């Protein structure tokens, strides 16, 4: 099945890079698909993205760290609170400006001497 495999491939890769989103994670938590165990079998199944020949395709990288964090299951009972999801979002964005702050520090350290 070429078309079925193609659609499963593309749909699964949009799902995991979508699963990089903390807000979509809060949507899945509040709308409560995490308590279903078909979903936990799916999330065990989705760890084939960690292979290099499958991680060759993941344009948004973080999804994989959060994917490990999803397998814990104490995690999925959590994230229904929007405050912790907002905290995860603040930490992701504040990490994302990392090399920019490294650039600012390096340019000012060059500027002072």
């Amino acid at each position: 099945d070429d078309a079925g495999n193609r659609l499963r491939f593309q749909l699964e890769l949009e799902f995991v890079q979508c699963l990089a989103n903390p807000n979509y994670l809060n949507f899945l938590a509040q709308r409560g698909y995490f308590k279903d165990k078909a979903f936990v079998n799916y999330l065990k199944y989705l760890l084939y993205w960690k292979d290099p020949e499958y991680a060759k395709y993941l344009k948004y990288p973080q999804c994989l760290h959060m994917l490990e964090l999803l397998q814990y299951e104490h995690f999925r009972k959590e994230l229904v609170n929007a405050q912790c999801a907002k905290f995860i979002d603040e930490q992701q964005i504040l990490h994302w400006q990392h090399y920019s702050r490294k650039r600012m520090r390096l340019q000012q350290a060059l500027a002072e001497q």
Binding site: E90, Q91, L94, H95, H98, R101
Partner: peptide, 10 residues
């Protein structure tokens, strides 16, 4: 390894 990224850097 960064543990916690503070608000406004640090």
């Amino acid at each position: 390894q960064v543990h916690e990224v503070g608000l406004d850097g640090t």
